[PDB]
Amino acid sequence: DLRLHLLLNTSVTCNDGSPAGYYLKESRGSRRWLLFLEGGWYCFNRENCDSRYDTMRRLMSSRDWPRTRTGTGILSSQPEENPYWWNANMVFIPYCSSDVWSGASSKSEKNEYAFMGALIIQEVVRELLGRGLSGAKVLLLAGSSAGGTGVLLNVDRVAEQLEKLGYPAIQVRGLADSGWFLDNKQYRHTDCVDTITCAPTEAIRRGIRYWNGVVPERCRRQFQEGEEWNCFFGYKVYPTLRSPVFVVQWLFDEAQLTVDNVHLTGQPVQEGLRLYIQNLGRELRHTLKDVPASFAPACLSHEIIIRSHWTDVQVKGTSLPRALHCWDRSLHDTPLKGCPVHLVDSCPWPHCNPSCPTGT
Ligand SMILES: CC(=O)N1CC2(CCC2)c2c(F)cccc21
Numbered sequence: 001d002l003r004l005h006l007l008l009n010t011s012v013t014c015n016d017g018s019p020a021g022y023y024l025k026e027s028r029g030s031r032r033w034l035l036f037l038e039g040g041w042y043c044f045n046r047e048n049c050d051s052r053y054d055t056m057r058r059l060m061s062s063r064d065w066p067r068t069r070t071g072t073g074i075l076s077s078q079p080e081e082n083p084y085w086w087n088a089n090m091v092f093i094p095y096c097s098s099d100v101w102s103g104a105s106s107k108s109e110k111n112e113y114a115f116m117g118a119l120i121i122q123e124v125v126r127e128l129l130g131r132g133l134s135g136a137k138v139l140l141l142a143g144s145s146a147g148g149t150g151v152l153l154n155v156d157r158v159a160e161q162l163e164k165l166g167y168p169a170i171q172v173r174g175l176a177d178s179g180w181f182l183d184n185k186q187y188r189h190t191d192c193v194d195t196i197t198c199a200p201t202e203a204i205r206r207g208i209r210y211w212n213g214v215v216p217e218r219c220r221r222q223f224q225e226g227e228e229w230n231c232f233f234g235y236k237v238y239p240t241l242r243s244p245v246f247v248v249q250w251l252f253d254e255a256q257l258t259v260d261n262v263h264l265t266g267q268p269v270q271e272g273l274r275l276y277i278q279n280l281g282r283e284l285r286h287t288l289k290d291v292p293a294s295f296a297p298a299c300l301s302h303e304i305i306i307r308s309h310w311t312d313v314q315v316k317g318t319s320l321p322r323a324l325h326c327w328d329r330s331l332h333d334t335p336l337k338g339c340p341v342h343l344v345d346s347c348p349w350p351h352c353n354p355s356c357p358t359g360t
């Protein structure tokens with residue numbers, strides 16, 4: 001189990017002003033630290049945030065958080081479940097800011113909600129330094145879904161923070177799971193008039209203003225004022241990043257398909273939708289061509305790294321825990337024989353890879 005710690009700096013809050021926090025399981029004698037960012041969509045205006053507060057309140061408030069959580073997948077401490085980093089110091093950072101981990105805005109007379117995702121990460125790192133993180137050799141900032149995009153938005157800021165605090169020896173790396181989205185054409189198009197019809201580009205554009213969202217500096221300088229939404233799209237922000245980032249992305253991610261207005265039921269897929277889906281997988285594969293550390297199976301699914309059976313999926317015969325281990329070796333101070341780090345499926349239809357999650 002990982003034990004809850006509410007932030008000692010109570011100015012760093014979840015959406016409703018309750019303190020943010022983190023769950024921690026220490027591993028004495030390990031200098032590896034895994035900080036995992038939870039996902040869970042986002043909200044971008046008063047109405048849709050109010051709705052989220054009614055029925056997804058744990059994503060907006062710490063008032064009902066349990067005092068412990070069980071580490072699963074890459075957060076498991078059992079080598080049977082986590083071949084990669086079972087002995088690491090484990091941190092699970094709950095997502096309670098609804099801002100894709102980008103916000104830097106407090107609740108105030110002008111703001112019904114606080115959007116502090118970027119500051120929560122910084123404050124967790126700061127408070128962990130006194131709990132052993134000061135001795136770390138590697139800090140892996142990982143995350144799934146909105147948390148995976150949060151890795152892309154925050155990994156270099158964590159690196160800068162540690163450098164400015166006087167810890168230049170801690171190697172900061174990112175692991176972005178299911179947070180690599182395409183600003184592609186939707187299969188069916190709706191004008192952004194409400195929440196359900198608003199495409200991610202426009203919803204993120206509105207969110208950034210509502211959250212006071214922040215993006216990595218080099219990406220911000222490329223796209224400039226009013227265009228920072230571009231930095232929420234992995235293929236655009238990734239080339240601007242300096243920290244090593246391993247990208248995990250299903251080629252047919254269910255959240256990507258949802259925002260594309262694709263809803264697979266059971267009837268035969270006809271030609272237009274068949275071509276749409278195949279083109280989506282091809283475009284995703286294309287965006288990963290120059291990403292040297294990546295794991296992209298041809299499956300219709302969503303998230304991987306904290307699932308208990310995350311070890312099952314393989315690309316070209318290599319599992320994700322193995323690929324991550326090979327990534328670790330590649331970052332020791334030329335490719336490795338039989339230890340690949342770039343694993344992208346080439347087959348063109350969901351479940352053409354036999355190791356895809358069953359959905360059972
Ligand atoms: C499914 C999808 O296109 N997006 C867009 C975005 C903004 C760039 C990543 C996102 C999140 F930040 C969290 C959940 C879904 C999504």
Ligand SMILES: *[C@@H]1O[C@H](CO)[C@@H](O)[C@H](O)[C@H]1NC(C)=O
Nearest residue numbers: 009010011012119120122123
């Ligand atoms: C608490 O966090 C805020 C926001 O990041 C920061 O401005 C402030 O200095 C912090 N307070 C302390 C005592 O560290």
